[PDB]
């Protein structure tokens, strides 16, 4: 009944109880426990689901408070806008601590332990993902650097994915989705976004057509975003 | 742009962002701010929605971890049961801190400030509600005392409601729902539960039939639970 084994189970209990911050803490220990070896596919995904839910909540709050702010500033009410933005600052604070936690873990333990193509792309995609969440709310040179780190991480992830994983591989397809969402939402470049998404979609269909749920959903998402961006 | 006014708005922003712990903190200040006067109907409900969501999450987690525990102990796996129960203890810890926070606030500021029948019943019902949440997981003499405080609070709430508020009043109907749920779930007495729920339902319909959404839902709930308890 090892510690690592104990933490993984605890993480799954946290997942069932929807106490994601705690789920993160447990998978954080697991990650910091091993040294030479890599996290299992299950462990790697538990950690990823944990952080996704932790940051997802704050991202949703942010979008809502951000929208209130937009409506109130255009309505002229300034006392309200100050309170809104003060509330947003607090949301942005957690977003920064959260991204910082997983990004540090990626460079210190996860990326260095990646021994296969699945592993490396997954972790590099995750790295791009969290620098992308920072860019969603940053503005000055901060946004610039967050945007830069995002592009660097995704390009690296794609170089490995494009050559080592199948076109229909869910991690590769997810990387394409996120990478293209990055061009569209952050770099406000729907041109580069559609080209990338279309290419990934086409390669997947080609493969599916010649030599055959995750891939199906991702591909539908790519499709939805593809048309949605053609307006 | 007063502080109280500022906190109430902040609470509403927290509600939109679904940061309930924070929503509680803001309404906690509002409550502790006034002295002679009472919370508005809006304020009183913001505080109530805040705590409901804060405790609701833990109650849902508890029910889930509690179920895992039940399945694993009957399966014989003891190492798992220890981890489950350890996780539950942590959930129960928050449940106790949460109830304790609102119960203290009720006896110190809220109950003492209640100047009308709406006010008094609302706060006494809330008091019964939180002693009831404690009883849901307690077991020894702890459960006994939690159950006792619950019954005392509800009886007091009902004496006021039965004589000062209309049978169709949502707070009175909610008190009946919760009070009857208490007899059934905590006191495992479906007899006393149905009698109470039926009486409240009948009085409401009588009133509705002679001298005319919240009341409609509550009444449906009373109905659903009424039949559901007839098995
Ligand atoms: Cl989201
Ligand atoms: Cl619940």
From Swiss-Prot, chains A, B:
Family note: Belongs to the 14-3-3 family.
GO CC annotations, alphabetized: cytoplasm
The organism is Nicotiana tabacum
Q: What is this protein called?
A: 14-3-3-like protein C
Organism's domain of life?
Eukaryota
A GO BP entry: protein localization
One Pfam family in the UniProt entry:
14-3-3
């Amino acid at each position: 009944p090892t510690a690592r084994e104990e933490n993984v189970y605890m993480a799954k209990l946290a997942e069932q109880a929807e106490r994601y911050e705690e789920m993160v803490e447990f998978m954080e220990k697991v990650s910091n426990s091993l040294g030479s070896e890599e996290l299992t596919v299950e462990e790697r995904n538990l950690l990823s689901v944990a952080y996704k839910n932790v940051i997802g909540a704050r991202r949703a709050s942010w979008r809502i408070i951000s929208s209130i702010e937009q409506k109130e500033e255009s309505r002229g009410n300034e006392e309200h806008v100050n309170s809104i933005r003060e509330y947003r600052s607090k949301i942005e604070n957690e977003l920064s601590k959260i991204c910082d936690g997983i990004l540090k873990l990626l460079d210190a333990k996860l990326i260095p332990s990646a021994a296969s193509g699945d592993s490396k792309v997954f972790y590099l995609k995750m790295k791009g993902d969290y620098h992308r969440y920072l860019a969603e709310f940053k503005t000055g040179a901060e946004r610039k650097e967050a945007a830069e780190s995002t592009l660097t991480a995704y390009k690296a992830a794609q170089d490995i994915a494009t050559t080592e994983l199948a076109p229909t591989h869910p991690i590769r397809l997810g990387l394409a989705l996120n990478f293209s969402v990055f061009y569209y939402e952050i770099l406000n470049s729907p041109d580069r976004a559609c080209n990338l998404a279309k290419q990934a979609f086409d390669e997947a269909i080609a493969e599916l057509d010649t030599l055959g749920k995750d891939s199906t959903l991702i591909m539908q998402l790519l499709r939805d975003n593809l048309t949605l961006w053609t307006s």
